[PDB]
């Protein structure tokens, strides 16, 4: 931070350095996808059809 | 100026300066322009003697 100069019977000020630490916050995303039983029976041929 | 402190030493940098108003009449005019919120209460606190 900056600092100003003043006279008189005020205590003399010194500059102040500030240190700050933040941290992450974990979230997620979820979505679904379905396959019918007949499609699974059809796609599990592997060269018999 | 040099003196010790609770951590280390303190350097006090001072500078003397002087000002003269070399105007014959009045060379600065101020006036109250706006109004902010009142600091005090307009209550009923009777003074106790």
Tell me which residue of A38, A25, A5, A34 sits closest to B17, measured CA to CA.
A5
The angstrom resolution of this structure is 3.7
Indicate the helix (H) or strand (E) that contains B10: strand B9-11
Q: How many CB atoms lie within 10 A of CB B39?
A: 5
Residues, chain A, total?
A: 49
Give the three-state DSSP class for B31: coil
Give the three-state DSSP class for B3: strand
- Residue A39 CA to residue A10 CA, distance in Å, equals 84
Indicate the helix (H) or strand (E) that contains B28: none
Give the three-state DSSP class for A23: coil
What residue spans of A1-49 are helical by DSSP H? 37-43
């Amino acid at each position: 931070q900056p600092m100003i100069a003043r006279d008189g019977p005020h205590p003399v000020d010194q500059p102040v350095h500030n240190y700050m630490v933040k941290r992450i916050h974990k979230r997620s995303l979820s979505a679904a996808f379905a396959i019918a039983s007949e499609a699974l029976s059809l796609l599990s041929n592997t060269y018999v059809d | 100026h040099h003196h010790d402190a609770i951590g280390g030493v303190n350097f006090t940098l001072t500078q003397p300066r002087a000002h003269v108003d070399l105007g014959v009449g009045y060379t600065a005019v101020c006036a109250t322009a706006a109004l902010r919120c009142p600091l005090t209460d307009m209550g009923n606190t009777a003074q106790n003697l």
